[PDB]
Structure 1
Amino acid sequence: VLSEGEWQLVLHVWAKVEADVAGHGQDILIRLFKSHPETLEKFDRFKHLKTEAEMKASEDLKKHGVTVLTALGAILKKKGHHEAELKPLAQSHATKHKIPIKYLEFISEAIIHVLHSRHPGDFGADAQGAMNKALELFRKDIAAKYKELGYQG
């Protein structure tokens, strides 16, 4: 459970991410794809992208980044009371998209890295610690739904 002070650090930086969701989304997905190439294979629509330049020029990739960040932002703003938003997501990622929990850990790492590159001032160690706890809570809650459905892993 994050404390009120920790949720405030998380949402204060998130408010900045919202100033340019598309730019942030693009940066995150590219970092994920370059650091863990196996993640790209889960996207039939992005499989054809071979270079970072191709990735940066893809409008469709940018649109998916807005989708991901908008859904995450909706969750974070719920401050832990996020059952209604989380279940649908866990269900589709477990049974339709077939995304192992480990990939959620990889995208969390990509988010933390990009938040650091873009907002050093609002993203020091304390905010970094609170964001990591928020992302862990997100994975933990998704992992429990995955286990119920038989996808733990």
Structure 2
Amino acid sequence: ASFDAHERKFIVDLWAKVDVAQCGADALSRMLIVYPWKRRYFEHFGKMCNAHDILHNSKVQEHGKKVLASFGEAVKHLDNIKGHFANLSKLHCEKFHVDPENFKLLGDIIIIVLAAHHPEDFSVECHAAFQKLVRQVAAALAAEYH
């Protein structure tokens, strides 16, 4: 489903206030703490035995930034989300072997991090616009699995 003009202005206006590095590091760290078995993907980054380790792991913090910077390019491709993520979708499947259910889990965590960092902008309708965005980013990234 396309984004109406209202939905687009919620997404565009908020995204311009987001600190992508800070938020990206927070989202990935929260995912690894709330769902510990997802640490299977990142055991090459070093110590991740507990939450203190995860939050002090510099390679996790960097990966969370580049994940959220990539998600944020959806905001300038709102008409063409499937097409923009298609190569990234094939890398997840063929090279990194990431279970595609993870895309909807991280999406839900990103919504909690946005809520905590922008409480005054993250109204009911702003939230509903982001929930749609996160849904469509998850489906684009799951698309090329085979």
- TM norm structure 2: 0.90
Map of 2:75 onto structure 1? 76
Map of 2:48 onto structure 1? 49
- 2:90–2:144 contact (8 Å) kept in structure 1: yes
SS in 2 for 1:145: coil
- 2:107–2:138 contact (8 Å) kept in structure 1: no
SS in 2 for 1:16: coil
Map of 1:120 onto structure 2? 119
Partner Cα distance (1:80, 1:36) in 2: 32
Q: Is the aligned partner of 1:94 residue 2:107?
A: no
1:52, CA displacement in angstroms? 2.1
Unaligned ranges ≥5, structure 2? none
- 1:25–1:68 contact (8 Å) kept in structure 2: yes
Identity %: 26
Map of 2:10 onto structure 1? 9
> Which consecutive segments of 4 or more residues in structure 1 shift more than 4 A?
none
1:44, CA displacement in angstroms? 2.9
Partner Cα distance (1:13, 1:40) in 2: 30
Q: Deviations over 1:10-42 (max 9, x none)?
A: 12121121xx22211111011111111121111
Q: Which moved more, 1:77-86 or 1:61-70?
A: 77-86
RMSD: 1.6
1:84, CA displacement in angstroms? 4.8
Partner Cα distance (1:16, 1:82) in 2: 21
1:83, CA displacement in angstroms? 4.6
Partner Cα distance (1:66, 1:111) in 2: 12
The change in CA–CA distance for 1:4 and 1:47 in structure 2 (over 3 A counts) is: farther
1:53, CA displacement in angstroms? 2.0
- TM norm structure 1: 0.86
Map of 2:32 onto structure 1? 33
Map of 2:57 onto structure 1? 58
Aligned residue type for 2:51: E
- 1:40–1:47 contact (8 Å) kept in structure 2: no
